[PDB]
């Protein structure tokens, strides 16, 4: 049971911390996480992701504790902290620029155009369109960023993020790996749950067993290859 009327969307104020993740930013914009985007713990993320999206603790504990590395605090982050390049934040994002050549934090409409224009002739994004977008975004980074980092780990994270927008913003069973364009576009562009537009929280739990085959299929269709060393080493904290 969750009451979305008790969780209205509100635009972030000037002192509200927001990060590179539309998932967490949207939860904050609805007060499932603190609207100020600060002093956020893994337990808070677990609860917020469950209440807002029906995303389960398996993925949120795993990703959450990696995310905690990005702050200087014992057990919390600000959402903006997650911009730390090379922990989770990576090149060839769907809606942000690469840090070496631009802003790796804020939503960018020109970057988002690739996703927005994907799956022409359908009213949904799906696994094949998501894979094509990942292929095109990586090619863009390889072309324009001489410092691009593209590893097994970044590629897996990227497919996980695509799987997230396909599942959390779904109309039908998230298993199907497709989501209305109208829902996904609001998610990214406004960091809002598209309630007025007809979206409802999944009644099916979204967990690693559900996401895994979607992730693997997106990767397979994306015609991916590693770059350089292919070293999957994360940055372990800020300012090292």
Ligand X SMILES: *[C@@H]1O[C@H](CO)[C@@H](O)[C@H](O)[C@H]1NC(C)=O
For 101, the token pair is 């050549």
205 lies in the binding site for ligand PDN (CB under 6 A): no
CB of 151 to a second copy, least distance (A): 9
CA dihedral 177, 222, 130, 202 (to 10 degrees): 30
Stretch 138-167: interaction string toward ligand PDN, x if CB under 6 A: ------------------xx--xx------
From CA 130, how far away is CA 159, in angstroms rounded? Answer: 8
Q: Is 39 in the site for ligand X (CB under 6 A)?
A: yes
Minimum distance between the CB of residue 132 and a second copy, rounded to whole angstroms? 27
Listed residue (61, 76, 31) closest to 207, CA to CA: 61
Using CB under 6 A as the binding rule, the residues of this chain from 181 to 210 that contact ligand HEM are: none
Using the rule CB under 6 A, which residue among 62, 122, 139, 231 binds ligand PDN?
Answer: 62
216 touches ligand PDN (CB under 6 A): yes
From 18, 96, 158, 192, residue interacting with Mg ion (rule: CB under 5 A): 96
The entry of Mg ion, a second copy, ligand HEM, none near residue 234 (CB within 5 to 8 angstroms by kind) is: a second copy
d(CA 206, CA 181): 20
Structure tokens at 235: 């940055």
71-80: burial string, b at 16+ Cβ within 10 Å, e else: beeeeebbbb
Helix axes 152-168, 181-190, angle to 10 degrees: 120
Give the whole-angstrom CA distance, residue 234 versus residue 91.
13
**Which residue in the set 7, 18, 30, 38 belongs to the binding site for ligand X (CB under 6 A)?**
38
Name the token pair of 160. 């996980």
- In the structure encoding, which two tokens stand for residue 88, read together? 């989770």
- Of 121 and 144, nearer to ligand HEM (C-beta) is 144
Nearer to a second copy by C-beta: 23 or 194?
23
Taking CA atoms, 187 is separated from 74, 83, 102, 131, 166, in Å, by 30, 19, 22, 19, 11
| Residue 93 contact partner, candidates Mg ion, ligand X, a second copy, none, CB within 5 to 8 A by sort of partner | Mg ion
Contacts to ligand HEM by CB under 6 A: 20-24, 45, 49, 53, 55, 60, 63-64, 67, 82, 88-90, 93-96, 161, 164-165, 168
Contacts to Mg ion by CB under 5 A: 89-90, 93, 96, 104
Contacts to ligand X by CB under 6 A: 38-39, 73, 76, 78, 100, 119, 121-122, 126-129, 146-147
């Amino acid at each position: 049971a969750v009451d979305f009327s008790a969780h209205p969307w509100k635009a972030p104020g000037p002192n509200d911390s927001r990060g590179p993740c539309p998932g967490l930013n949207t939860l904050a914009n609805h007060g499932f996480l603190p609207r100020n985007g600060r002093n956020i713990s893994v337990p808070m993320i677990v609860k917020a992701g469950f209440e807002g999206y029906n995303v389960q603790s398996d993925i949120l504990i795993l990703a959450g504790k990696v995310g905690m590395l990005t702050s200087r605090e014992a057990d919390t982050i600000s959402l903006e902290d997650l911009k730390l390049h090379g922990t989770i934040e990576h090149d060839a994002s769907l809606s942000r620029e690469d840090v070496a050549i631009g802003d790796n934090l804020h939503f960018n409409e020109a970057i988002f155009t690739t996703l927005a224009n994907s799956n022409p002739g359908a009213d949904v994004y799906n696994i094949s369109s998501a894979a094509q977008v990942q292929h095109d975004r990586l090619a863009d980074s390889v072309a324009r960023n001489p410092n691009v980092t593209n590893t097994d780990l970044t590629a897996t994270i990227r497919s996980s993020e695509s799987a997230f927008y396909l599942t959390v913003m779904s109309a039908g069973d998230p298993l199907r790996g497709e989501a209305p364009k109208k829902f996904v576009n609001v998610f990214f562009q406004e960091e809002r749950m598209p309630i007025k537009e007809g979206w409802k929280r999944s009644t099916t739990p979204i967990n690693l067993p559900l996401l895994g085959p979607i992730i693997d299929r997106i990767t397979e269709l994306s015609d991916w290859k590693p770059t350089g060393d292919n070293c999957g080493a994360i940055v372990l904290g800020p300012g090292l």
